[PDB]
């Protein structure tokens, strides 16, 4: 409705025309009585073991992530497996009933078919439904703040930034790590500044120029014990920001569920994009943290910056 | 890698686990001759053709997006459906070997067993397969950069807008209208100025302040035959920079095919936040084009200047 070459969105067309094949192939079964209908639900039951074998082992790649992608919650791997276990479990009792009105031997054809069509990779997704299942979530906010993050301000900031923090060091006293320290708390809820985060960490300061586009970078001090055993420059994770922004832009149907599981997604392609990235070799180092016994974040910037020498 | 939380991609634990039920299933047989094959490639071919006819009716949905989503190409949407036709015809005419070692009534019964599987949204995708599918595709940019641009700028700009525009009417002439037209070339390829874009359009200046964040509003007035029928407020698209940027970064497989279908995606996204936002009832409107008789761009703004008024 803007441009003639814009996609609109999908329609129900796909189940519209779905009823015209039924209707068109339940009449051909009036060309011939009642003894297919026994037939057709044990038919049935078969796309559904085939369904119910596809979802467990599966299962047992989702048992490697049990921590991390499920919390150690043992029965949301199954439900994130096999889709539904209601609208498919009730017909698979129906067929039971059907199947009485060598039966292991016969059960365990269809065993190994499905298997050969996973091992060949038969089970195969078109690209339509492997668009049509990207477009449908609105919410698929992770590799677009990744990548634009890197574009846009990673790869403009960093090849500036060693010479901004040896001029600071010719100015002087306080020797400060030549790296960038970026910190993702997944938890994300980002405040303003980093005093009220953590009164361990408590400095402000502004990184000065080269001596157009103007990034102000304060350098936090870590008080160790009320002394600056550590100086270092900490920036926040502004694509953080807006995965808080969303969920509070209750327009849109954002929960706290949703944006976790994009704010780890976001840091893993992050984490990516500098493995091999000409100018984050040795600047950026990336601190993710989620903290609830709420522990101290200046300590494991610490580790951090103490394992770099 | 970096915290425990953080889920590790997926590995072929799915492949692993088959052959082994696959093991387990074939010594089973093992257990009872030869009468078995015969049926199970039978059995195997059912699953095919429930496959083909899952491409069909979906073959229906993509004749409404041929111009738009597959470039008016009759033979892209056959292969967007079904997925690959190599692997999946290649057994069903291996079956017809092996079933001549009613056939339409047959034919029949499975035909509309796998209408109502779509009918009644029997195909379920588990939530494990929705997400593997989503963070295969590493370039899955279109609604981040869609949601972290109105929250990141467009939330910021637009509310303080109308009262930059009123004082440079206040300062004079010529009347500015109260708009922001946001352009969004689809062959993205995005300049830095727009005097060379098109020498129709050759201003430049600077929008003032209100009288913390600058943002520089260059206001370019038409110069329809040389005269300056139209002045008004144009920015290019930020997010199409990055999109051109990451297919010349080579290191990522981005090719000119990826770009195209996620700025497409792009414009619809933001066509969808800024009609349900609060500030941008009125403020910001989109002006998409791509040019191959390479025409004006000059002459649309234009047509959705004087629409306004
Ligand atoms: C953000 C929404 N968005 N999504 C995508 C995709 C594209 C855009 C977008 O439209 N960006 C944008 N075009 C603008 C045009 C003007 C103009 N006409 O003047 C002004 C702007 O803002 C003025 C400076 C900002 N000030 C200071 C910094 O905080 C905010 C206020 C503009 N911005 C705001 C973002 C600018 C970059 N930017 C970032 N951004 C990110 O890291 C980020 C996160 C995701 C996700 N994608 N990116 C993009 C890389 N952090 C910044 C911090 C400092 C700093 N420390 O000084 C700093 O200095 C400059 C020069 C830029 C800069 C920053």
Partial sequence: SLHPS???????????????????????????????????????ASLQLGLLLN?????????????????????????ACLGCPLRRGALLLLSIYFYYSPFTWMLALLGLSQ????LLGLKGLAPAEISAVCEKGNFNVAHGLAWSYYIGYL????????????????????????????????????????????????????????????????????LENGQRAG?????????LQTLFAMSQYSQAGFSRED????????????????????????????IAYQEPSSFSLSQEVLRHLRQEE
Same sequence: chains 1, 2.
């Fill in 6 to 44: 814009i996609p609109c969105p999908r329609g129900h067309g796909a189940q519209k025309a779905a009823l015209v094949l039924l209707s068109a192939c339940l009449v051909t079964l009036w060309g011939l009585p009642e003894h297919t209908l026994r037939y057709l639900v044990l038919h049935l």
């Fill in 55 to 79: 979802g467990v082992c599966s299962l047992a790649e989702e048992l490697r992530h049990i921590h991390s992608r499920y919390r150690g919650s043992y029965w949301r791997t199954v439900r």
């Fill in 115 to 118: 298997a050969l069509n996973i």
């Fill in 155 to 222: 790869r403009l900031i960093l090849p500036e930034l060693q010479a901004r923090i040896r001029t600071y060091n010719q100015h002087y006293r306080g020797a400060v790590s030549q790296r960038l320290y970026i910190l993702l708390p997944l938890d994300c809820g980002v405040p303003d500044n980093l005093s009220m985060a953590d009164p361990n960490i408590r400095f402000l300061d502004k990184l000065p120029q080269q001596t157009d586009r103007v990034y102000s970078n304060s350098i936090y001090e870590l």
């Fill in 231 to 239: 100086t270092c420059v900490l920036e926040y994770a502004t694509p």
């Fill in 259 to 286: 944006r976790l599981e994009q704010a780890k997604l976001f840091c893993r392609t992050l984490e990516d994009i500098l493995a091999d990235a000409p100018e984050s070799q040795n600047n950026c180092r990336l």
